[PDB]
Symmetry: C5
Subunit: 311 residues, 5 copies
Amino acid sequence: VSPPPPIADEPLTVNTGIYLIECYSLDDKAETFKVNAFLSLSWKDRRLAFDPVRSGVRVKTYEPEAIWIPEIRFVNVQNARDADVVDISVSPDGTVQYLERFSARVLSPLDFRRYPFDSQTLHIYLIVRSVDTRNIVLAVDLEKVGKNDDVFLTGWDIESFTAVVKPANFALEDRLESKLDYQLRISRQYFSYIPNIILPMLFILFISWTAFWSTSYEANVTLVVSTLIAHIAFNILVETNLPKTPYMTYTGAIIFMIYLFYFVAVIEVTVQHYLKVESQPARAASITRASRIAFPVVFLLANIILAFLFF
Amino acid sequence: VSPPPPIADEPLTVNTGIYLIECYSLDDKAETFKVNAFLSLSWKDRRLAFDPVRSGVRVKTYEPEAIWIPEIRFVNVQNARDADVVDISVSPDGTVQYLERFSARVLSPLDFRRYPFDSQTLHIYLIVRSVDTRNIVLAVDLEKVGKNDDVFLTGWDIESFTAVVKPANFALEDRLESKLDYQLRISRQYFSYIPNIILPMLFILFISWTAFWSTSYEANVTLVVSTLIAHIAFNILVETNLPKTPYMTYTGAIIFMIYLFYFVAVIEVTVQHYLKVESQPARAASITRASRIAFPVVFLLANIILAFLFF
Amino acid sequence: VSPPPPIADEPLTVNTGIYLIECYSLDDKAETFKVNAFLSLSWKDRRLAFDPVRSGVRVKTYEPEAIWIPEIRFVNVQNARDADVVDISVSPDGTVQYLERFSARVLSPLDFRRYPFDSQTLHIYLIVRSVDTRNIVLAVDLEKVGKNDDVFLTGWDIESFTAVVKPANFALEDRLESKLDYQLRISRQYFSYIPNIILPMLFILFISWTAFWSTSYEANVTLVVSTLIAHIAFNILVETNLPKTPYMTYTGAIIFMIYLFYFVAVIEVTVQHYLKVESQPARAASITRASRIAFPVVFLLANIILAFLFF
Amino acid sequence: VSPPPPIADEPLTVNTGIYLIECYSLDDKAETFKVNAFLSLSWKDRRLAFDPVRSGVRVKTYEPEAIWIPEIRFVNVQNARDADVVDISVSPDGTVQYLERFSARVLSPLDFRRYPFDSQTLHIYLIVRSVDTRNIVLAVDLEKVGKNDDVFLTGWDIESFTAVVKPANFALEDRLESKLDYQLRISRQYFSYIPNIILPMLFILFISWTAFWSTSYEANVTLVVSTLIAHIAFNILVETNLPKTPYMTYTGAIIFMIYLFYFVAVIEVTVQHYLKVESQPARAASITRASRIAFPVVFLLANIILAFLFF
Amino acid sequence: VSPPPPIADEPLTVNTGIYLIECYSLDDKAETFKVNAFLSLSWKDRRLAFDPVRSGVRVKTYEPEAIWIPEIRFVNVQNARDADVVDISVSPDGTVQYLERFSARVLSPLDFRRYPFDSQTLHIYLIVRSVDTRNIVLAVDLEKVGKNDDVFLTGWDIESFTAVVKPANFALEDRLESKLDYQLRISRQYFSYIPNIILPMLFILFISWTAFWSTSYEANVTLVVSTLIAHIAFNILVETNLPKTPYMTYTGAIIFMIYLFYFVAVIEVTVQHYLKVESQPARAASITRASRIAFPVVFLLANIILAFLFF
Ligand SMILES: [Cl-]
Ligand SMILES: [Cl-]
Ligand SMILES: [Cl-]
Ligand SMILES: [Cl-]
Ligand code: NA
């Protein structure tokens, strides 16, 4: 089968629509999401036209083998979607209404700068390659774009699923390509990060600060070194959940900055001890009293500055 | 092949049944289960009718290619089931009795609020899409709904496998869809959580409390900081087995609360030492004696409050 | 093609045989094993009969598409086996001798009660579903049941591969099913568990007991708390290799019991210190001397009781 | 179908081109990358010749089954690419213009010597095997070689995608093979390695050096042994992200060298203590003062020497 | 199609050859390797004979569907290879020259006794099953056995790829089977094990021995218990890279033996302290001085004995 012939010099408009049935998974490290949805396609093939009077049937159902169908592909996939055709219905003027249910693993990059208080725009880019007989342009049938009520992405809140209705038409290997942008806007459920990472990480930091009410070097060294090791365990945990970014993430900046606080607390504990040993406990007492205020104050101000820079 | 024609204006009733052969797996993190079962379908196709006298045969066996079969799909799947047809038997009036054995990975969300003392209702939603020639409705043949006695889901107890017999009929892309709800009710085998997570986590908490019968700051700091680090190891272990929920789970609440107990025990140990150093051991002795009772009492009362809130 | 017709009212006997080519893998957590074997089937189809004189050929080779073949399936699989037919040979009386080489991932449950000194009976349940024209019964051709000499399951010793020659005949969805039980008896190579888990776990326990020859509370607290943390690391390691069971395993019971020994050792260390501080070192000396004998004696007796209960 | 016949004794030139649509993944441990691209092929088959007068059509579209297509394979793959033909267009003279969209997992080795400041040349080697009727040579159509602007490899910067235009023609099993070298030059985004591994690893090393301002053996032993254990945690983390190389990597050399610094710091701490105990604190004081300068100086010089050797 | 008929009572000789294109991966835990290679087959089918004079063509190319091809399978696989036929060329006498490119995951057991200084013989066992019409024997065409120069197995050195030219002919289910043994001899690149596991493990052992130049029980307990915990971390790391063997490996023996050294060092530290406390420092001083020499001497002699036993 060949594509539909033009009346004038007009391109063939393939109207499209995506209705999500299942999203469910998103892999932050791989920057992929798994989607299962309907892909509806519609175009006019005058060669398939008929009259209700003489034909009897008001609509004709066809097998994909029997008629011409445009080759629609997703841009941002590593493996092409697994499609199963559901229905092909031809109307009197030859308007074909195609429907398939697909499953794909879509490669859409994430911006982790504000992680875990980040929002993302996930994309599904539909594309059609023009043939020598006719140029094929894609369109959006907004009534056939949407999502099922039960669509819930684990660890995320789905805000919208829309389409940039004007295609990106361009040349690629001396043939026109018509690209459409379907956008799934999501925002992270940051909740669990608070009792599991943020508050435990702060509690161990505040425990290292009890060294400012202790004259015992041996105990101080245990407090600051023990909690530093628990901090490294949270840093390793956090960095396993995320990919390696050429920029700093919000959590990454706090995790990094908290090392400097442990480092400076080791210096304070060292200084305090050296002075007691040098028979200067009055000088040591002054530094320790200042540290009791300076460490929480600088921690609160430094975190205000970070939240300002990131949000 | 086209669908069966109606006598009046009646829809085609496709009677369904699911008989589980294997369940075996459930992934809490992914919120999926793997199922292997029989899917029996039955409908009337008058075009396939015959008489026992003239035909000889009392039933006719058909290949799926030879006759019309309704396109039945599962709603809550990422990838469509792998089906193998077992038998297609046509009776005199044209009653088709279809049987397939399928395997699918079903996306069914879990409520972890009471974890690991949680029960779940897993679902398999069957769906049929109506054609232009006829509207297709799904039904439940309760005699063909069940499970094999050897069906055992690892780490769970299967309570029941039933079907919500009245379908959810609705419009989707200007065509009727007939959805059925098959429900597998399960309850978690909470047993192993007790000797592996709950009791080890309590033993290390009770070891931190021996600091209330010690005047040795260095030893106290080791007791409370060491056991806090073993608590973090159990918190990380627990959170790897579960997905990130926008609500608190039962185990998550206990795990979180136990951090506050370690934190307050570090404050007690600090206060006690500061006082001995300030030559106030009588005041420190009073706080330490109160702590011996206050810590277990508040721990028991706080756990009673939690169990009340969650169950 | 239809099934072979009966002479009288006799069912069709499909003789079966499984010859293992590769086993190699068993996953304790998933409770699955991967098998690659020959599946030989044999039945009489009189419609395929011929005479050696007039036909010339003493045996006729057929493609599976050309003749009737019984639909044989495995019960305990999530996904059906991948089969490749090797040969189909028809003898003069119409005796069909079918041979395929398959690969399957079989769901067979394990009893971890005596882990890692456990033995298991793995099963492959063959099943045939009777047709309306004839009832199909399965049989065992013991000469066609066996295993290749090179068949070795990693981490296990294969003891036998036999078949329960009498099928379990029963009704399922108003049709007879004929089930056969192929049993692969295996016993775990418990060796590596000794230098990798058992002896390291005992060495750290015996190191905690050196606290009974020490008056130093600070050192004692380090000995018992440090080794408890290494015990938790072994408990986590062990529980990652096994699934969550609604019963206690042998290793699990020892691992759990050893926590009680650490807990009681923390109590002894606490009591001993409290007494030295209260100026009662003579009383503390008595408890410490008793502990030196009591801890190893109760440990040896408690382990004798466990080994009795489990074996 | 047989291959096109020659006019003279000329080989068939199959012009090739690869246009990358998605790269996205690279696995350092496996030394693989996942690619999704267009593979365009072009050759002359005079047997397929026609012209618009007599045929009507100016170009003829063909199914791959209908015409001869050269068997083009990738050399460096474990599993052959998943190809989907997009278009086959036959011109006047019989010039076939083939286009497929493939997905492959390509095995291309990496040189980790300068890790994580390393650059790599990834390869896709195309190959064609000559037939007895005709020798087949591969060529590069540079206008059909390139990459999409949105092509971004996670954790890397893509520098170029070119082709070594002259094929490597050679004999293999008494038949000519024509190999082409497509090269994807990439450089690692080393950024994240700094706040996540390099700076944390240096902070813990500098904390071990506070032992040079402490006379407390107990505290010193805790400082150096605790931080050594956090160093081992970073060494294990680093070695899990990389494969086992028969050469030293840059990060591996620093990680290894830092062990010698911990070892020598344990010797210093031991020596210092032994002397204080032997009533030689003046000698110990001299060694400790020298160490305060020697450790950072030798660390800075040793790192200059390493950076010199590796870059 | 039927197999070629014999002249006398001679079996059909199927000449074979394997030319490796990619090896690349080997999984020690699974005891598998992934291979991609050419499989060339050659046999005489007199029914396919022709004369160059009358036929014109000097060689005839055939599709696999058109002629008889022997069913060749690999013995040691879980899943059968993915093959793609490259060429089938028939010579005048009817000599068929078949060529396919396959990909397989081969199950070949490894001997870890000398790990990581081990060498292995990996096998690919080809097999053919004789038919009733003719007995089929396999042979080796040594000119068609080899490997590509770019074939490099990550973490290993390939020493040779040869074939045991005489097949293992045997009966299996009353039919002859002809098995060939292709052997890939490899030796491990042990290099990385030295800076990553061996030297770090020795450095922490030598750090525990600094306790023989310390009178400080508290410090000694920290030195030996801390380093024991880092030893357990290396033991767990090593045992995750290897499968559970019913024999001791070289690394496993050293790792195990080093626990006894830690255990005895804890006894020494305990004895030394007990004596100082009992006012016997002269006796304790003697044991500590002996230990300084005894521990390294016994460690060096015990390692010489092990290297002797294993190599
Ligand atoms: Cl390929
Ligand atoms: Cl095979
Ligand atoms: Cl024999
Ligand atoms: Cl034979
Ligand atoms: Na300490």
